[PDB]
Amino acid sequence: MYHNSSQKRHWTFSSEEQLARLRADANRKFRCKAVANGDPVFLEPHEEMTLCKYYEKRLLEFCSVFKPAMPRSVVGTACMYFKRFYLNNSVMEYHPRIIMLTCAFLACKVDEFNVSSPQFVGNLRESPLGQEKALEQILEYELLLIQQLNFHLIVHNPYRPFEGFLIDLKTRYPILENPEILRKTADDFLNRIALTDAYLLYTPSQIALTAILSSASRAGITMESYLSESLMLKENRTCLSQLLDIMKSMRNLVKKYEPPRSEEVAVLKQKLERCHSAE
Amino acid sequence: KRYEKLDFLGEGQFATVYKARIVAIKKKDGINRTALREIKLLQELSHPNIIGLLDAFGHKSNISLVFDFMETDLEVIIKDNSLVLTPSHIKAYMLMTLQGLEYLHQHWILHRDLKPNNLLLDENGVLKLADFGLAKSFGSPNRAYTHQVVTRWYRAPELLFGARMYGVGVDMWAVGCILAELLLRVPFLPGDSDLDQLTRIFETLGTPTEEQWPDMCSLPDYVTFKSFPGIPLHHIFSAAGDDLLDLIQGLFLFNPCARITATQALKMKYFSNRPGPTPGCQLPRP
Amino acid sequence: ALYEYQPLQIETYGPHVPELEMLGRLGYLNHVRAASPQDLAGGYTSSLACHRALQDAFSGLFWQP
Numbered sequence: 052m053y054h055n056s057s058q059k060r061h062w063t064f065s066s067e068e069q070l071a072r073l074r075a076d077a078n079r080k081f082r083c084k085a086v087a088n089g090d091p092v093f094l095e096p097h098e099e100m101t102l103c104k105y106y107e108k109r110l111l112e113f114c115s116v117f118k119p120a121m122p123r124s125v126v127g128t129a130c131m132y133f134k135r136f137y138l139n140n141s142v143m144e145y146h147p148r149i150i151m152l153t154c155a156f157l158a159c160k161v162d163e164f165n166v167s168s169p170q171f172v173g174n175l176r177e178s179p180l181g182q183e184k185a186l187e188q189i190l191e192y193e194l195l196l197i198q199q200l201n202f203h204l205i206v207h208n209p210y211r212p213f214e215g216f217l218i219d220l221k222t223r224y225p226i227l228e229n230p231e232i233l234r235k236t237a238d239d240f241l242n243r244i245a246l247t248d249a250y251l252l253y254t255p256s257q258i259a260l261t262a263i264l265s266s267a268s269r270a271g272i273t274m275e276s277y278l279s280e281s282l283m284l285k286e287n288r289t290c291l292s293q294l295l296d297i298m299k300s301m302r303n304l305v306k307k308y309e310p311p312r313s314e315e316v317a318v319l320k321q322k323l324e325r326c327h328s329a330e
Numbered sequence: 331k332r333y334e335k336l337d338f339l340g341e342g343q344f345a346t347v348y349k350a351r352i353v354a355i356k357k358k359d360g361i362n363r364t365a366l367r368e369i370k371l372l373q374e375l376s377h378p379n380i381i382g383l384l385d386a387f388g389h390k391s392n393i394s395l396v397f398d399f400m401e402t403d404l405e406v407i408i409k410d411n412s413l414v415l416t417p418s419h420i421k422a423y424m425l426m427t428l429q430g431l432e433y434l435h436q437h438w439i440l441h442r443d444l445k446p447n448n449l450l451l452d453e454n455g456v457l458k459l460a461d462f463g464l465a466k467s468f469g470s471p472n473r474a475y476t477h478q479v480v481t482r483w484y485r486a487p488e489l490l491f492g493a494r495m496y497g498v499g500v501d502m503w504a505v506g507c508i509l510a511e512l513l514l515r516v517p518f519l520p521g522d523s524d525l526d527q528l529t530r531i532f533e534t535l536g537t538p539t540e541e542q543w544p545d546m547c548s549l550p551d552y553v554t555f556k557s558f559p560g561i562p563l564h565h566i567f568s569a570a571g572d573d574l575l576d577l578i579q580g581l582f583l584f585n586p587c588a589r590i591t592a593t594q595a596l597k598m599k600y601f602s603n604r605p606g607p608t609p610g611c612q613l614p615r616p
Numbered sequence: 617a618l619y620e621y622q623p624l625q626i627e628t629y630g631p632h633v634p635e636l637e638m639l640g641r642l643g644y645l646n647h648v649r650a651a652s653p654q655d656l657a658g659g660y661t662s663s664l665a666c667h668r669a670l671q672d673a674f675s676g677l678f679w680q681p
């Protein structure tokens with residue numbers, strides 16, 4: 052369960068500043084290691100973040116058309132794996148294209164989605180020899196990824212809390228006559244929430260509740276009494292204020308998110324390929 | 331890494347175990363799925379009656395898992411004729427097993443491999459559930475499991491009838507079998523095949539009916555059986571008091587839903603009655 | 617030295633989850649898929665799925681890193 056999970060204990064961070072510090076530390080550590088080992092070829096932390104967002108989108112696309120049909124829990128686990136890995140690692144050291152496939156592979160294993168390695172690499176849009184090489188790279192990086200996750204493999208996603216909240220709304224909140232009308236829109240917000248760092252900063256229950264209440268807000272429906280009455284937050288005013296602040300910060304995170312730009316990602320991909328070819 | 335190998339503990343088909351410094355280290359598909367299962371489940375669980383995963387590492391596709399070192403297991407206790415199993419000792423073992431199982435089920439995980447050799451004991455007499463290589467989360471509707479889990483002697487009748495969807499009963503039934511093995515010092519239902527296992531279960535406990543198990547014939551591998559009267563529980567366990575017999579009956583109910591859960595078993599009069607469970611430091615050691 | 621049961625006291629940092637046996641009475645089970653007779657025979661009930669979903673929904677809702 053989340054309330055005593057490794058995700059809550061170790062992989063939920065206090066602020067975006069802490070995440071930026073971790074990523075800058077990873078970038079500077081790679082720079083120091085390369086200087087001791089081996090220039091403007093180096094990537095900046097914001098460039099690394101842009102490439103990480105692009106390859107998270109690529110991982111989403113790969114998991115979307117994966118045959119057999121990938122459970123959404125597996126996709127969430129793989130995306131969280133990617134985020135956690137590149138919290139403490141530089142894309143110039145470990146290429147995101149292989150790391151994301153390793154994340155998908157490990158997530159398939161962890162979430163008990165039985166898919167054989169040949170049919171895992173058959174989903175790749177590459178030649179059979181390319182698929183074999185990619186399989187070899189994934190097998191090389193599997194233990195590396197597991198080590199960099201600190202052997203914390205169970206990932207608590209917001210989908211089951213979303214289902215539980217929908218059940219609770221259907222049962223105890225008749226004011227919202229049909230909570231199902233909130234699903235689609237809320238799901239959309241969930242996806243957008245996944246694009247930010249919210250998964251490293253907020254609980255899955257908070258993320259699901261924020262998605263549902265934002266869907267209600269775009270629907271023109273106020274369910275403040277659901278927090279107040281149903282969740283008994285009228286008793287704890289500070290708890291209600293903290294929850295509302297968490298949701299507002301989450302919405303601000305979504306509104307401040309910027310998609311990677313195609314020219315920027317092309318230039319940064321050239322720089323990343325130069326980094327991997329060199330050193 | 332930081333572990334000096336001390337002794338060779340045992341070797342199985344699946345892994346090899348070493349006593350190292352005191353801990354126990356267990357060694358194109360990539361990293362093996364059972365080791366990943368153990369890692370992913372034991373990292374999210376923390377209870378005195380569940381084996382603790384202290385560390386893990388490896389190289390390439392091989393991996394080693396570090397656990398607390400255990401002195402013995404319940405199988406060695408049962409098979410040791412010199413050891414005398416008092417009702418206090420049996421209650422202590424059952425209490426520790428059920429507390430671990432209650433913690434496990436509360437976090438929505440089925441062990442699915444409960445047996446005396448998977449119930450490990452340390453030098454302080456603290457029993458812990460081990461060998462989570464078959465453990466799996468439960469409570470998900472779409473998640474369908476295989477019915478070939480649990481060792482056949484401890485397999486529940488619903489599993490032997492091919493149940494894909496199941497709950498804590500598949501552990502509780504095993505618990506009951508373990509309890510029976512604690513009372514008789516021999517395997518309760520030592521079948522040599524699934525059909526033989528079902529036949530032994532029905533010849534000992536009686537052939538279940540619709541009243542005892544409303545949806546019995548709906549299981550895809552259900553087999554019709556000759557109506558057996560079954561041996562009365564007090565005849566099988568002549569030394570078992572009424573409270574222990576009630577516990578056994580609750581653990582061996584054919585209906586998995588009606589079968590008592592770990593919490594309900596812990597609430598039974600047997601555990602709160604005299605004599606109290608033997609303290610862990612006073613439990614017998616082989 | 618007599619044993620006495622006490623339920624596990626693990627903080628969930630969220631709203632209280634209704635008891636498993638009272639899910640049907642409170643009306644929760646009307647909003648989850650009913651278990652098939654085979655699932656019921658195996659010991660799986662819709663109450664399990666509903667309870668797990670509610671527990672996941674309420675877990676750590678009030679927690680701050």
Ligand SMILES: CC(C)c1cnn2c(NCc3ccccc3)cc(NC[C@@H]3CCNC[C@H]3O)nc12
Pocket residue numbers: 339340347354355356381397398399400401402403406447448450460461
């Ligand atoms: C948690 C695991 C990795 C562990 C911890 N201590 N320990 C010991 N200790 C020695 C021993 C000797 C006799 C009976 C029990 C334990 C032996 C051992 N043997 C490997 C098998 C693992 C599954 N259960 C049966 C066991 O033989 N596995 C383990």
